[PDB]
From TrEMBL, chains A, B:
<dbReference type="GO" id="GO:0005829">
    <property type="term" value="C:cytosol"/>
</dbReference>
<keyword id="KW-0378">Hydrolase</keyword>
<protein>
    <recommendedName>
        <fullName>Cytokinin riboside 5'-monophosphate phosphoribohydrolase</fullName>
        <ecNumber>3.2.2.n1</ecNumber>
    </recommendedName>
</protein>
<keyword id="KW-0203">Cytokinin biosynthesis</keyword>
<dbReference type="GO" id="GO:0102682">
    <property type="term" value="F:cytokinin riboside 5'-monophosphate phosphoribohydrolase activity"/>
</dbReference>
<dbReference type="Pfam" id="PF03641">
    <property type="entry name" value="Lysine_decarbox"/>
</dbReference>
<dbReference type="InterPro" id="IPR005269">
    <property type="entry name" value="LOG"/>
</dbReference>
<comment type="similarity">
    <text>Belongs to the LOG family.</text>
</comment>
<dbReference type="InterPro" id="IPR031100">
    <property type="entry name" value="LOG_fam"/>
</dbReference>
<dbReference type="GO" id="GO:0009691">
    <property type="term" value="P:cytokinin biosynthetic process"/>
</dbReference>
Amino acid sequence: RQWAVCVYCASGPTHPELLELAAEVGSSIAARGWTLVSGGGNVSAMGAVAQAARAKGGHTVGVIPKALVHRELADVDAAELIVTDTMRERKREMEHRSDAFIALPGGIGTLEEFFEAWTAGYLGMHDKPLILLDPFGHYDGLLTWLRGLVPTGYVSQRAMDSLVVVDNVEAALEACAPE
Amino acid sequence: RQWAVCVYCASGPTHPELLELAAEVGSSIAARGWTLVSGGGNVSAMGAVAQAARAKGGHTVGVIPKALVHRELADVDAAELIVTDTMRERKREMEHRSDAFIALPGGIGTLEEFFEAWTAGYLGMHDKPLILLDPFGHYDGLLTWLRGLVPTGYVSQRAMDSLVVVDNVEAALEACAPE
C-alpha cells in the first residue's frame, strides 16, 4: 500500500498558473512513489494533476459521484476510477484512501472539501496533515479573513495552527510525507 | 410534516450579540409554527437557537455525531435527537430533515456546513433556500473574497446569486418560507 496524497482542486478554470501548479503537484507525487487520490474528473486542475501523475508512471485513484460523471468528465484513464452514489460518499472514499491532503486553488466545491477535512482534523477525527498550497495569492483574502476570526473566538489559534499554508510544491510534499 | 428550517451556527463564543441573534432566530422559527433543525448541542449559538425555539413550544430536532455528544453538550431536551456515527451522516440527516437553510456567524464547522449546502444546491442536488444571516458584518471579508473569484471563473455569478444574504431575522425567515 503506497502512501497516498489526496489533492482537492478546481473543476473550472483553465488558467495556465493553475494547470501548471496542478501538473507539478501530480508529477512530484508520482516521482516520490506515492499514489495520487483526486476527484476523478478530466477538467481544469483535476485533469491536470492526474494526467501529470500518469506521465511520470504514478498510480492514480479518481473518486467521483455518479451525478458528476458527465459534468466533470469522469477520468477513464485513472488506474482506479471509484464512482460513488453520493457526494458525501465521494468525500469519505477520498479521505479513507489518503494519508494526507492538499488543497489547491478552487471554488465552492473545493472549499467545502477543505473545510470538511480541516474541521475533522481539528476535532481529532483523523490525524492526517492538511496543506493549503497557494503560490499565486488565490486564498490571501480568505486567510486574512479566517485570522480575524481568532481574536473574536470563532476560530481557535489551535485550529489555525493545524493548517499548513505554503507557496511551493516541495514544501507541500515535505509536510505530507510519512514521519 | 411541518415546514423545517435548519440553522447552522457557532459552537464556540458567547458574545451577547451572537447569542441574542441566535435566540431571536429560534424564537421566530417557533413563532411561525415551524420546526428547527440544528446540530443538537447546547453550546454557543447552537444552544441558544434550540433553547429559544423549544421555550416557545417549538418542535426541535438535533443531529449530533456520537463523538461530539460530550464536548458539544448534546441537546437531550430536543423533541428529537439523532445521534449519528459520523460528521457526514450528521450533515446528511440535517439536510434531509430540512426545507431551508440559515447560516449564522460561526467558524470552520459552520463554514463546512454552509459550503456543502451551497455546493449541493448549485449542482442541482436540491432546490432548498440557503440564507446567510449576518447583522454585524461577520462575513463581510469572506463575501468580498468570494466575489473576487467571479471575474476569473472560480465561482460563477449564478453561484453567488444563489446565496440570499440578509442582515435581519425577518428577511431571513421570509426567504425560507414555503412558496
